[PDB]
Design an enzyme around this catalytic site. Structure first.
Site, PDB file in Angstrom:
ATOM      1  N   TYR B  26      32.485  31.033  33.611  1.00  0.00           N
ATOM      2  CA  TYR B  26      33.230  30.166  33.600  1.00  0.00           C
ATOM      3  C   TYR B  26      32.304  29.812  34.610  1.00  0.00           C
ATOM      4  O   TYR B  26      31.907  30.254  35.866  1.00  0.00           O
ATOM      5  CB  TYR B  26      34.094  30.019  33.588  1.00  0.00           C
ATOM      6  CG  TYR B  26      34.857  31.081  34.651  1.00  0.00           C
ATOM      7  CD1 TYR B  26      35.609  32.689  34.765  1.00  0.00           C
ATOM      8  CD2 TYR B  26      35.772  30.190  35.714  1.00  0.00           C
ATOM      9  CE1 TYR B  26      35.948  32.425  35.544  1.00  0.00           C
ATOM     10  CE2 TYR B  26      36.145  30.666  37.145  1.00  0.00           C
ATOM     11  CZ  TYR B  26      35.810  32.451  36.708  1.00  0.00           C
ATOM     12  OH  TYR B  26      37.130  33.243  37.520  1.00  0.00           O
ATOM     13  N   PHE B  36      35.332  25.159  43.380  1.00  0.00           N
ATOM     14  CA  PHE B  36      36.358  26.563  43.778  1.00  0.00           C
ATOM     15  C   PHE B  36      35.562  28.038  43.578  1.00  0.00           C
ATOM     16  O   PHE B  36      35.951  28.905  43.781  1.00  0.00           O
ATOM     17  CB  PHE B  36      37.127  25.929  44.313  1.00  0.00           C
ATOM     18  CG  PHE B  36      38.331  26.696  42.442  1.00  0.00           C
ATOM     19  CD1 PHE B  36      38.252  25.585  41.296  1.00  0.00           C
ATOM     20  CD2 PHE B  36      39.180  27.450  42.862  1.00  0.00           C
ATOM     21  CE1 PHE B  36      38.476  25.978  40.318  1.00  0.00           C
ATOM     22  CE2 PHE B  36      39.213  27.739  41.428  1.00  0.00           C
ATOM     23  CZ  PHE B  36      39.276  27.127  40.079  1.00  0.00           C
ATOM     24  N   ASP B  37      35.112  27.948  41.675  1.00  0.00           N
ATOM     25  CA  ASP B  37      34.737  29.581  41.728  1.00  0.00           C
ATOM     26  C   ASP B  37      34.256  29.560  40.781  1.00  0.00           C
ATOM     27  O   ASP B  37      33.719  28.416  39.941  1.00  0.00           O
ATOM     28  CB  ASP B  37      36.368  29.838  40.256  1.00  0.00           C
ATOM     29  CG  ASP B  37      36.498  31.007  40.232  1.00  0.00           C
ATOM     30  OD1 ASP B  37      35.159  31.905  40.537  1.00  0.00           O
ATOM     31  OD2 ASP B  37      37.090  32.070  39.517  1.00  0.00           O
ATOM     32  N   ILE B  56      45.281  31.967  33.271  1.00  0.00           N
ATOM     33  CA  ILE B  56      45.947  30.845  33.203  1.00  0.00           C
ATOM     34  C   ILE B  56      45.970  30.295  32.034  1.00  0.00           C
ATOM     35  O   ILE B  56      45.250  30.507  31.390  1.00  0.00           O
ATOM     36  CB  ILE B  56      45.782  30.049  34.175  1.00  0.00           C
ATOM     37  CG1 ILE B  56      46.763  28.842  34.904  1.00  0.00           C
ATOM     38  CG2 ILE B  56      44.202  29.687  34.379  1.00  0.00           C
ATOM     39  CD1 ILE B  56      47.723  29.339  35.442  1.00  0.00           C
ATOM     40  N   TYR B  82      48.334  26.283  38.026  1.00  0.00           N
ATOM     41  CA  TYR B  82      49.549  27.074  38.891  1.00  0.00           C
ATOM     42  C   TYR B  82      50.001  26.475  39.515  1.00  0.00           C
ATOM     43  O   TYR B  82      51.298  26.736  40.219  1.00  0.00           O
ATOM     44  CB  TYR B  82      48.574  27.578  40.847  1.00  0.00           C
ATOM     45  CG  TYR B  82      47.334  28.489  39.865  1.00  0.00           C
ATOM     46  CD1 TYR B  82      47.845  29.848  39.059  1.00  0.00           C
ATOM     47  CD2 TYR B  82      45.980  28.473  40.054  1.00  0.00           C
ATOM     48  CE1 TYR B  82      47.056  30.835  38.969  1.00  0.00           C
ATOM     49  CE2 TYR B  82      45.264  29.185  39.399  1.00  0.00           C
ATOM     50  CZ  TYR B  82      45.240  30.655  38.987  1.00  0.00           C
ATOM     51  OH  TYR B  82      44.345  31.791  38.416  1.00  0.00           O
ATOM     52  N   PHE B  99      36.745  23.331  33.843  1.00  0.00           N
ATOM     53  CA  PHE B  99      36.179  24.918  33.774  1.00  0.00           C
ATOM     54  C   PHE B  99      34.986  24.118  33.233  1.00  0.00           C
ATOM     55  O   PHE B  99      34.475  24.104  31.691  1.00  0.00           O
ATOM     56  CB  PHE B  99      36.486  25.979  33.347  1.00  0.00           C
ATOM     57  CG  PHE B  99      38.208  26.070  34.195  1.00  0.00           C
ATOM     58  CD1 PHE B  99      39.294  25.489  34.153  1.00  0.00           C
ATOM     59  CD2 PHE B  99      38.156  27.105  35.463  1.00  0.00           C
ATOM     60  CE1 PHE B  99      39.644  25.482  34.949  1.00  0.00           C
ATOM     61  CE2 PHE B  99      39.342  27.704  35.717  1.00  0.00           C
ATOM     62  CZ  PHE B  99      40.256  26.594  35.277  1.00  0.00           C
TER      63      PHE B  99
END
Lengths: 327, 107, 384, 820
Positions: B26, B36-37, B56, B82, B99
C-alpha cells in the site's frame, strides 16, 4: 553442625565455582605483584622524533606526561560545586606516587646516590606541573574527606619526600601569586573532620566481637572488617606528614606563610588548628585511660588502638616540631 | 463510508476470504496529497491477517472488495479511520485518507 | 533592624559596612582605638544610630546629627577621642585579629545580641537582633574582615542603580493613565538618558567572557560573573528590572507610549525595552538559581513571546531560562508549547526557536516525555 | 528542490540541520513511541539514500547518520551497553570449550593472542526487540499508561551492516589517495559519522566473526593477520576521528576482558570437578585411616569439619611454595593450577621490535605516538586515550576489578535469568527519564516480575552484584525529590519500590547489611513520605536494621540525631498535608511522630532484648529535646499524660474535631486515634528503652539512673489509670446486627499493651497488694470483657481478636511471672 554438615564435594557446581573464583582472586591475584609504574612514566616522559625541524618555540609540544598533568589540572580548575570521583585520576595519581619512592652500614657516599636518584625521580614529575596540580586538587576538594583527596596527599608526599627545596619553592610561589583562600579553607576543614578515639564506638566494637556472627556461604571466623575507631587514622597520618614535609628543611619562608597569609584576604592559622586537633586527640586518649583504669590488663584491640593513636600523636608532634624549628 | 476506484484490474474471480492472510503493498497519502506511509520504501510486503481487525477498519473492509492482482485506490473517511483522536504525530485529527493498495498475492 | 545573622547571608552584599570617620582630610588614616567614626551600610546608604524610640537602628543620612551616630572601637571594656594626626597614623587595628568592642561614644553603651527568642526563633534560624546594651555581655567582640574591590564596587553599584530605577519607576507610573493629548507631559521628565547609559553599562558589566581566553583565566571570570549576578539578584535588582519591563509592557506601540508620556519619549521606548531584555538575559544567563526564579511566573515571559517590538530579546531570555533550569521544564504545559510553535508560524523560520524546542526535550541528560509527546503531537502531523 | 542545493543555500541548511537535531531530541532517550512516528516523516528508503549520497553537505550527512542511530539503534545499544559491565557465565559444554589461547604451536607458556572479539562468548545478554513500523494497524483498545511498552522500530541489520562495512572500506581507500574533494566536505565529516555507526553495530553485536576480522584488517592490516590498503592508524587523522577510534579500541579491549573472564570461569568449571573428585576420594581413604593412624587424624578431618569456603582457601593456599605441606592436593593438580596461572599472566602481558604483534602493545604504542605527535586539545579525547593506556598497562588490575561483577549460574536457570535481565534493563532505562504514568506501570509490573522470578530468591548474591537495590533506590529518590515540598506525586509506585526493598532485606543478612550502608541516605529522604500510606522510605530503614545485633550496634548516633530532630519537628509543627484536607489544627503532627517512634522502637529492641547503648542514646536525646514528648509532658503549661489521654478519648468520640467530617477517605486520619497511638508508641519506646532486669540486679549505675529518669518522666499512677480505662465493647442486638466500634478512630487494646509493657519493664511488680490493685481495676475488667466476647457471635470480630492478642501477649505472661 560442623561434624555433620555438607562436605565440599556435595555442593552444586555453580556455587562451588563461585567459591573457587573468590578464593582464587583473593589468594593468587591480589597477592600477585606487578611493578609497571616505572615503565609507564619512562614511556610517558619521552618526546622523541619531533626534533627534526629543531624549532625554537619556547613551549614546543608537551610530552605525554605533561599533557596528562595539564588535563588533570584543567579538570581541577573547572568550576564545579562538588569534586566527582575520577577513577582514572585515582589510578594515575597512585601510579605517579608509587613511581617516585621505589622503597647494614651504608657508606655516606653511596647513601648520597639513592637520595640524588630520588631527587631526579621526583624532578621527572614536579617539573611538569604535578606540584601545582596537587595544590589545585586540594583546593578543589573543598574539605570533603575521601579517597580522592587521599590519593592527592599521597602524591604530594611522594613528590615531597626528603623535603625537596624546589617543590617547596614552586608550591610557595603558586600559593603566593594565586592568592586564593580555597587551599587553606579546605585544609582547615579536612583537619577539623579528622576523628579521635571513641569509647562508645569501641564498646560497640567489643560487643560486636562478643557476638562473633558468621555468614552462610561457608564461614568467616573473626572477620577483619573495617574498624569503627580511628578508621581515617592513615589519612590523618599522611595529612600531617604532608604538612611536615612542607615545612621540612627549615623553610622559614613557608613557615611564616602557614601562620599567616599576607597576600590572601582571609588568614587561617594552621598552627592553632593543629593544636586544636592535638587537644581533641589527647582528650580522647585521656578518656581512654579512665576506661582501663579499673582494668589491669589491656586486651589486643585496645593495644591496636593505642598503637595507631600514638603513631598519629607522633606525626602531630613531628609536624609541630617542624613548624618551629629554624627557629 | 469507503470509495474504491480501480487503477489497474487484476483477476476479479478470487476474492479475499476469511482464513487466508492478505499480502499487500500500500501507499497511504493524506487528503492534501502529502504521502505519510508506504510499504515499498520499507521494501517489504505488509501481510495482514484479515478478519481479526488488527488494521484500521477502512483498509480492512476496502481490501475485501478488490480482488487478486488489483491496484485499487481507497478513500477512508475518519469514521472508518483514526477519527478525532487521530494518530499521534503522524495523522492529523479528523482526516480522510487515501491508499494505493495492491494485493500482489494471497500468501 | 540590625542582626547578628549567620550562614550564607554575609557572603552577600547586605553585610558590608563602610567606616566613615569625622575628618575629611586624612580620612583613610590607620584606625586608632576609641576614636569617633560613623558606620554606613553601602548598599542602603544608611548610618548606624541610637534613636530614642527604637534604640539601635539604621537611620537615613539626612538625619545623622553625629551625636547618635558616632561610634568607637576599643580593645577592652574599661571606661575610657584623641588629637588628630596629619599623617598616615599609627597602625593599631588589624584584619582577622585584634578583637574589637564597639562602643557608642555619646551614650557609652555596648552592642549585644538580644537575649529574647520567640516562637519563630524556637525552630527558625537565630536572627539575634543587635541591641546596644548598657553594659554588654562577654563574647561580643568583633573581628574585622576585608572585602574584595569587586564586591565593594558592585555593592556601591546596586545602591546607585536602585535609586535610579526606583526614580524611573515612580516617574513611569506617575503618568500611568492621564492621556497627554497635545499638551505637556504629566510631571517631571523621565531620566531616559541616564537609564539608557546605566543599562548599557550594566550589559557591559555582565558581558560573558570570550571563548579565546585560557581555561584558567576563563573559569575565574566565570566565578566573577556568577558572583556579581547573584549579588544583584540577592539585592533585588532582578525584581526591580522585572517591574521595569512590567511597567513598559502595558503600551502596545511607541505612538501609544507617546500619547501618555510625550513624543520625545517615543523614540527611546523601543531601545529601552531591548536594553532591559538584554540586561535580564545577562543577569540570568548561566545561573541555576536566578533561572529557577522564573519557575513561578513562567507565563510572564511566554505571554510576551508574540510582541514584535522585542522578539529576539525575549526569545533569548526564554532560551537562557530553559537551557539552565530543569525545574522550569516540568512547569511547561500545552499552552506554552502551542505558544512557542506559533512563533514558528508567525515570525518565520527562526532556527533559534528549534533550539528552544530542542532544549525542551532533554535537560541535563534527563528526558521529559510529557514535553516530547506535546511537541511531536503539535508540530509534526500538520506537515506545514 | 534538490536537497543537494542546500550546499549553496546556506540559509535553509542551518534550519534543516537544526530540524534533524529536533528530530533526535523528540525521539531521544528511549522514546520508541515517538521513534515510530518519525518513521513516517523520514522513510527507510530516504535514510538509506541519504546514507549513500556522496554530495550531501557535512552537517546534513552527520545529522542523517545520527538520526538513523537515534531512531533505530540508540535504545538497543544503550540497553546492551549497560549489560556489558556484567558477566553472568552459564556452565555449558561450549563454555567449557573456551580457553585463554587458540589451539596452536607457538609456545606452551603463551601462543599467539586470538583476534579480539573473534570467537565464542557465552555471557548472558538479552536479545534485542524490534517492532516493524505499520501506520495502518488498528489503534489499541488499551488506554494510555496501560498499553505494553513500545519497542524500537525495526530496520534490516544484515543489509545495514553490509552497507556500513562497504562504506567504511570505501572511505579507507579514498583517504589514501588524498583527494581535494572529501565526502561531505572534510575528512572529519567523512570518517566521524561512519565510525559512529560502526561503533554502534559493534556494541549491539551485529557483526559476525568474519566481519570483525574485516574491521580488524581495515584498522590495522599487518598486526591482525591470522595464521591504498593502509590502516586507519597511519592516515594522519584529526582529533575528532581519533575519539571514535579510541571507542573502537575500547570495545575490543572490553571483548578481551570478557574473554579472560569466560576462560577463567571455564577453568573454574573443570578444576572444581577435579577438586571435588580428589577431595571425595581422600575422604573415602580417610574413612579407612582408623586401622593404621593415631590422634593426628584431627588435622586431616579438619577440612571436612570446616565449612567449604575456607576449605577451598586452604586447598589453594600453596602459591608461594612455602606452605605446600598443608595443601593435600597431589602435584598433578597443583601443576594444573599453576599452569593456568602462568598463561593467564602471559595473556594479561605480565612476563613471558617495531612489530606490536597484538592489541595490548598496539594500543599503548599508538596512544603514546598520538600524544607525542601533537598537543592534543580535546579533553574527551585525552581522557579516552589515557584510559585506554591505563587499561593496557594495568591489564591485571581491570580484570581484578572485573571479578566482583562476574558470576556463574546453572544451565537450567538461563531462561529465568533472561527474563530477570530484561526487567532489570527496563528499570535501568528509567534512570534517564522523568517519571510519568506510562513509566509507573512499566516498572510496577517489572518489579512484580522480579518478585515472581525464582532466581531473585535462589541467588541473593547475584542481585547484589547486579546492584538491583541501588537502581531501585535511585529511582525512588528521584521521585521523592520531585515535589519534595508540596506533595509526592506517584505514591503507588513509591510504595511498590519500598515493598520490594523490604522484601529484599528479608532475603538474607548480607542483603540487609548491604541495605544498611544507605541508612543515612534513606533517613534524609524519609522526612516527607510519611503522609503517603503503606510502605514508606522509612519502613525500608526499619527493615534494614530489623532484628540484627551487629547492625543495631553499628547504627550511628547521628542517625538517631536526625530521627529525633525529625520527631521534634513532628511534635512542634502541624502537618501541612493534614491542614489542607480541612482538618482542625493542632500544633503538632501525631501520625508523623508515631511513624518516627515505631522506627526507634525497632532500633532499640532486637530479639526481645533491649540494646543498652541505643536505649541510653535515645533517652538522652529525648530528655535533651522535651518537645519530642509532645504538648503534654512539657512541664510548664502542659497537662499530664493521663489528661492528654482522656482529652484525646473525648476528641475521638466527639466528631467535628476528630477530623473534617465532610474510612470515608479509605485512609482517613483521625486526630483522636492519632494522639493516643502517638503516646502509645512513645510509651512503648520508653518501655523497650528500659534496662534489662539483670543490669538492675547487678546494680549498674547507668541502668539505675536511666530507670530513675523513666520513672520521673512517666509516673506509675497515671499508667495504672490508663490501664484501668474502659474500652468500647461491641454489643449484640438490633435483630442480630453485631455492632462494632471504629477501631481506626477509638481506644484500642494495643494502647494498653504499650502501657503494660512500660509498667512491666520500668516499675515492675514486687508486692502483692499493688499487684491485686493493678488487677481489679486494670486487668480484671479486661478478662471479663473478653470472656463475654468469647461466644458463637463475637469471637471472630476484630475487637475480640485485638483483646485476645492484648491479653495473651501483654497481660497473661505478666500474671504468669507474678504467680508467687
Amino acid at each position: 553442625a560442623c561434624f555433620r554438615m555438607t562436605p565440599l564435594y556435595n555442593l552444586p557446581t555453580h556455587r562451588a565455582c563461585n567459591m573457587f573464583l573468590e578464593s582464587y582472586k583473593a589468594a593468587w591475584i591480589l597477592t600477585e605483584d606487578h611493578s609497571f609504574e616505572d615503565r609507564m612514566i619512562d614511556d610517558l616522559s619521552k618526546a622523541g622524533e619531533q626534533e627534526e625541524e629543531e624549532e625554537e618555540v619556547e613551549e614546543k609540544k608537551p610530552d605525554p606526561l605533561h599533557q596528562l598533568v595539564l588535563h588533570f589540572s584543567r579538570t581541577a580548575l573547572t568550576e564545579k560545586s562538588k569534586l566527582d570521583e575520577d577513577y582514572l585520576y585515582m589510578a594515575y595519581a597512585d601510579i605517579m606516587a608509587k613511581s617516585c619512592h621505589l622503597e647494614v652500614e651504608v657508606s655516606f657516599e653511596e647513601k648520597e646516590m639513592e637520595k640524588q636518584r630520588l631527587l631526579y625521580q621526583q624532578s621527572r614529575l614536579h617539573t611538569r606541573g604535578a606540584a601545582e596540580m596537587v595544590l589545585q586538587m586540594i583546593s578543589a576538594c573543598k574539605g570533603e574527606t575521601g579517597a580522592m583527596v587521599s590519593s592527592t596527599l599521597k602524591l604530594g608526599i611522594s613528590i615531597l619526600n626528603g623535603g625537596n627545596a624546589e617543590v617547596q619553592q614552586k608550591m610557595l610561589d603558586y600559593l603566593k601569586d594565586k592568592k586564593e583562600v580555597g587551599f587553606f579553607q579546605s585544609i582547615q576543614a579536612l583537619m577539623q573532620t579528622c576523628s579521635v578515639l571513641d569509647l562508645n564506638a569501641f564498646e560497640r566494637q567489643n560487643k560486636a566481637e562478643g557476638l562473633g556472627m558468621v555468614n552462610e556461604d561457608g564461614t568467616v571466623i573473626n572477620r577483619q572488617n573495617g574498624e569503627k575507631v580511628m578508621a581515617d587514622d592513615e589519612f590523618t597520618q599522611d595529612l600531617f606528614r604532608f604538612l611536615q614535609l612542607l615545612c621540612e628543611g627549615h623553610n622559614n619562608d613557608f613557615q611564616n606563610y602557614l601562620r599567616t597569609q599576607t597576600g590572601n584576604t582571609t588568614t587561617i592559622n594552621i598552627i592553632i588548628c593543629t593544636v586544636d586537633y592535638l587537644l581533641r586527640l589527647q582528650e580522647s586518649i585521656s578518656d581512654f585511660y579512665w576506661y582501663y583504669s579499673g582494668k589491669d590488663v589491656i586486651e589486643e584491640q585496645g593495644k591496636r588502638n593505642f598503637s595507631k593513636a600514638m603513631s598519629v600523636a607522633k606525626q602531630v608532634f613531628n609536624s609541630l616540631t617542624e613548624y618551629i624549628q629554624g627557629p | 463510508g469507503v470509495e474504491i476506484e480501480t487503477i489497474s484490474p487484476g483477476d476479479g474471480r478470487t476474492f479475499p476470504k476469511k482464513g487466508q492472510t492478505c499480502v499487500v503493498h500500500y501507499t497511504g497519502m493524506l487528503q492534501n496529497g502529502k504521502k505519510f506511509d508506504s510499504s515499498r520504501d520499507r521494501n517489504k510486503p505488509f501481510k495482514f491477517r484479515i478478519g481479526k481487525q488488527e488494521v484500521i477498519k477502512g483498509f480492512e473492509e476496502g481490501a475485501a472488495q478488490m480482488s487478486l492482482g488489483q491496484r485499487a485506490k481507497l478513500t477512508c473517511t475518519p469514521d472508518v479511520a483514526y477519527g478525532a483522536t487521530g494518530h499521534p504525530g503522524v495523522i492529523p485529527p479528523n482526516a480522510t485518507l487515501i491508499f494505493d493498495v495492491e494485493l500482489l498475492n494471497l500468501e | 533592624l540590625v542582626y547578628y545573622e549567620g550562614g550564607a547571608v554575609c557572603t552577600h552584599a547586605r553585610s558590608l559596612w563602610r567606616l566613615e570617620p569625622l575628618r575629611i582630610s586624612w580620612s583613610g588614616s590607620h584606625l586608632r582605638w576609641g576614636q569617633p567614626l560613623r558606620i554606613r551600610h553601602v548598599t542602603t546608604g544608611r548610618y548606624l544610630a541610637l534613636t530614642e524610640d527604637q534604640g539601635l537602628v539604621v537611620v537615613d543620612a539626612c538625619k545623622a546629627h553625629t551625636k547618635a551616630t558616632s561610634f568607637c572601637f576599643r580593645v577592652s571594656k574599661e571606661k575610657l577621642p584623641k588629637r588628630d594626626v596629619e599623617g598616615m597614623g599609627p597602625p593599631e587595628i588589624k584584619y582577622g585579629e585584634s578583637l574589637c568592642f564597639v562602643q557608642h561614644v555619646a551614650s557609652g553603651l555596648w552592642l549585644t545580641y538580644a537575649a529574647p527568642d520567640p516562637k519563630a526563633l524556637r525552630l527558625g534560624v537565630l536572627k539575634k537582633k543587635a541591641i546596644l546594651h548598657q553594659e554588654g555581655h562577654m563574647d561580643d567582640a568583633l573581628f574585622l574582615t576585608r572585602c574584595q574591590q569587586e564586591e565593594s564596587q558592585a555593592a556601591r553599584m546596586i545602591h546607585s542603580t536602585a535609586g535610579l530605577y526606583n526614580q524611573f519607576i515612580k516617574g513611569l507610573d506617575s503618568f500611568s493613565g492621564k492621556p497627554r493629548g497635545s499638551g505637556p507631559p504629566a510631571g517631571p521628565a523621565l531620566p531616559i538618558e541616564a537609564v539608557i547609559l546605566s543599562l548599557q553599562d550594566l550589559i557591559g558589566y555582565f558581558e560573558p567572557p570570550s571563548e579565546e581566553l585560557q581555561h584558567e583565566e576563563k573559569q575565574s571570570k566565570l566565578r566573577s560573573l556568577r558572583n556579581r549576578q547573584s549579588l544583584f539578584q540577592e539585592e533585588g535588582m532582578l525584581s526591580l528590572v522585572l517591574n521595569c519591563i512590567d511597567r513598559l509592557n502595558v503600551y502596545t506601540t511607541a505612538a501609544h507610549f507617546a500619547e501618555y508620556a510625550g513624543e520625545e519619549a517615543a523614540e527611546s521606548w523601543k531601545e529601552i525595552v531591548n536594553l532591559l531584555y538584554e540586561l535580564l538575559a545577562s543577569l540570568i544567563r548561566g545561573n541555576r538559581a536566578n533561572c529557577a526564579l522564573f519557575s513561578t511566573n513562567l507565563d510572564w515571559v511566554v505571554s510576551k513571546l508574540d510582541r514584535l517590538e522585542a522578539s529576539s530579546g525575549i526569545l533569548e531570555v526564554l532560551y537562557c531560562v530553559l537551557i539552565e533550569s530543569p525545574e522550569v521544564l516540568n512547569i511547561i504545559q500545552e499552552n506554552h508549547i502551542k505558544s512557542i510553535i506559533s512563533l514558528l508560524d508567525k515570525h518565520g523560520r527562526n532556527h533559534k526557536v528549534l533550539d528552544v524546542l530542542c532544549s525542551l526535550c532533554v535537560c541535563n541528560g534527563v528526558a521529559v516525555r510529557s514535553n516530547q509527546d506535546l511537541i511531536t503531537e503539535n508540530l509534526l502531523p500538520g506537515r506545514e | 528542490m534538490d536537497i543537494l542545493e542546500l550546499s549553496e543555500r546556506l540559509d535553509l541548511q542551518r534550519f534543516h540541520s537544526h530540524t534533524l537535531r529536533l528530530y533526535r531530541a523528540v525521539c531521544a532517550l528511549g522514546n520508541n513511541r515517538v521513534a515510530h512516528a518519525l518513521c513516517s516523516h523520514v522513510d527507510q528508503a530516504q535514510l538509506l539514500h541519504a546514507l549513500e549520497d556522496a554530495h550531501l553537505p557535512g552537517p546534513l550527512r552527520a545529522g542523517y547518520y545520527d538520526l538513523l542511530i537515534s531512531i533505530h539503534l540508540e535504545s538497543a545499544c544503550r540497553s546492551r551497553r549497560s549489560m556489558l559491565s556484567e558477566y553472568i557465565v552459564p556452565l555449558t559444554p561450549e563454555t567449557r570449550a573456551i580457553t585463554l589461547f587458540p589451539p596452536g604451536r607457538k609456545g606452551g607458556n603463551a601462543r599467539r593472542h586470538g583476534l579480539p572479539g573473534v570467537g565464542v562468548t557465552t555471557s548472558l545478554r538479552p536479545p534485542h526487540h524490534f517492532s516493524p513500523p505499520c501506520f495502518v494497524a488498528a489503534l489499541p483498545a488499551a488506554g494510555v499508561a496501560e498499553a505494553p511498552a513500545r519497542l524500537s522500530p525495526a530496520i534490516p541489520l544484515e543489509a545495514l551492516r553490509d552497507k556500513a562495512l562497504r562504506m567504511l572500506g570505501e572511505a579507507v581507500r579514498d583517504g589514501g589517495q588524498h583527494a581535494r574533494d572529501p565526502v561531505g566536505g572534510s575528512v572529519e565529516f567523512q570518517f566521524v559519522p561512519v565510525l559512529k555507526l560502526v561503533s554502534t553495530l559493534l556494541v549491539m553485536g551485529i557483526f559476525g566473526d568474519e566481519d570483525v576480522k574485516q574491521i580488524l584488517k581495515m584498522i590495522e592490516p599487518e598486526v591482525f593477520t591470522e595464521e591504498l590498503e593502509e590502516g586507519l592508524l597511519q592516515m594522519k587523522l584529526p582529533e575528532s576521528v581519533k575519539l571514535q577510534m579510541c571507542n573502537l579500541l575500547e570495545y575490543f579491549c572490553d571483548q578481551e576482558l570478557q574473554h579472560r573472564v569466560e576462560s577463567l570461569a571455564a577453568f573454574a568449571e573443570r578444576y572444581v570437578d577435579k577438586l571435588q573428585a580428589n577431595q571425595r576420594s581422600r575422604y573415602a581413604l580417610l574413612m579407612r585411616a582408623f586401622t593404621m593412624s593415631a590422634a593426628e587424624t584431627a588435622r586431616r578431618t579438619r577440612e571436612f569439619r570446616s565449612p567449604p569456603q575456607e576449605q577451598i582457601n586452604m586447598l589453594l593456599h600453596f602459591k608461594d611454595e612455602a606452605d605446600e605441606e598443608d595443601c593435600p592436593l597431589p602435584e598433578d593438580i597443583r601443576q594444573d593450577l599453576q599452569d593456568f596461572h602462568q598463561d593467564l599472566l602471559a595473556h594479561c602481558g605480565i612476563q613471558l621490535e617495531k612489530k606490536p604483534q597484538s592489541l595490548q602493545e598496539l594500543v599503548s604504542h599508538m596512544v603514546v605516538r598520538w600524544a607525542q605527535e601533537d598537543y592534543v586539545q580535546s579533553p574527551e579525547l585525552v581522557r579516552a586515550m589515557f584510559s585506554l593506556l591505563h587499561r593496557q598497562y594495568d591489564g591485571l588490575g581491570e580484570l581484578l576489578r572485573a571479578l566482583p561483577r562476574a558470576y556463574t549460574i546453572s544451565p537450567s536457570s538461563v531462561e529465568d535469568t533472561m527474563s530477570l535481565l530484561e526487567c532489570l534493563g527496563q528499570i535501568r532505562s528509567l534512570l534517564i527519564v522523568q517519571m510519568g504514568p506510562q513509566e509507573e506501570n512499566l516498572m510496577i509490573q517489572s518489579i512484580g516480575n522480579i518478585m515472581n522470578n525464582k532466581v531473585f530468591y535462589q541467588h541473593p548474591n547475584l542481585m547484589r552484584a547486579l546492584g538491583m537495590h541501588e537502581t531501585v533506590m535511585e529511582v525512588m529518590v528521584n521521585v521523592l525529590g520531585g515535589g519534595e515540598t508540596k506533595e509526592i506525586r506517584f505514591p503507588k509506585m513509591v510504595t511498590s519500590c519500598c515493598r520490594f526493598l523490604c522484601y529484599f532485606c528479608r532475603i538474607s543478612r548480607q542483603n540487609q547489611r548491604s541495605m544498611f550502608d544507605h541508612l543515612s541516605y534513606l533517613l534524609e529522604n524519609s522526612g516527607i513520605g510519611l503522609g503517603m500510606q503503606g510502605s514508606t522510605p522509612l519502613d525500608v530503614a526499619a527493615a534494614s536494621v530489623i532484628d540484627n545485633n551487629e547492625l543495631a550496634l553499628a547504627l550511628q548516633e547521628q542517625d538517631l540525631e536526625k530521627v529525633v530532630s525529625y520527631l521534634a519537628g513532628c511534635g512542634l509543627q502541624s502537618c501541612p498535608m493534614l491542614l489542607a484536607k480541612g482538618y482542625p489544627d493542632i500544633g503538632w503532627n501525631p501520625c508523623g511522630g508515631e511513624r518516627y517512634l515505631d522506627f526507634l522502637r525497632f532500633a532499640v529492641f532486637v530479639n526481645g532484648e533491649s540494646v543498652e547503648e541505643n536505649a541510653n542514646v535515645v533517652v538522652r536525646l529525648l530528655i535533651r529535646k522535651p518537645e519530642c514528648f509532645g504538648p503534654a509532658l512539657r512541664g510548664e503549661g502542659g497537662s499530664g499524660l493521663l489528661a492528654a489521654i482522656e482529652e484525646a478519648i473525648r476528641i475521638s468520640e466527639d466528631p467535628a474535631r476528630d477530623g473534617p467530617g465532610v474510612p470515608p477517605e479509605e485512609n482517613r486520619v483521625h486526630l483522636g486515634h492519632a494522639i493516643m497511638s502517638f503516646y502509645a508508641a512513645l510509651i512503648d519506646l520508653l518501655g523497650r528503652c528500659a534496662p534489662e532486669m539483670h543490669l538492675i540486679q547487678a546494680g549498674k549505675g547507668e541502668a539505675l539512673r536511666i530507670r530513675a529518669i523513666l520513672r520521673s518522666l512517666v509516673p506509675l499512677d497515671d499508667l495504672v489509670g490508663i490501664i484501668s480505662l474502659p474500652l468500647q465493647i461491641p454489643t449484640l442486638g438490633k435483630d442480630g446486627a453485631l455492632v462494632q466500634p471504629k477501631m481506626s478512630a477509638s481506644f484500642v487494646p494495643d494502647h494498653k499493651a504499650s502501657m503494660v509493657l512500660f509498667l512491666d519493664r520500668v516499675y515492675g511488680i514486687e508486692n502483692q497488694d499493688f499487684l491485686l490493685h493493678v488487677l481489679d481495676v486494670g486487668f480484671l475488667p479486661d478478662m471479663r470483657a473478653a470472656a463475654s466476647l468469647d461466644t458463637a457471635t463475637f469471637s471472630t470480630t476484630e475487637m475480640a481478636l485485638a483483646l485476645n492478642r492484648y491479653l495473651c501477649l501483654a497481660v497473661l505472661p505478666l500474671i504468669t511471672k507474678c504467680a508467687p
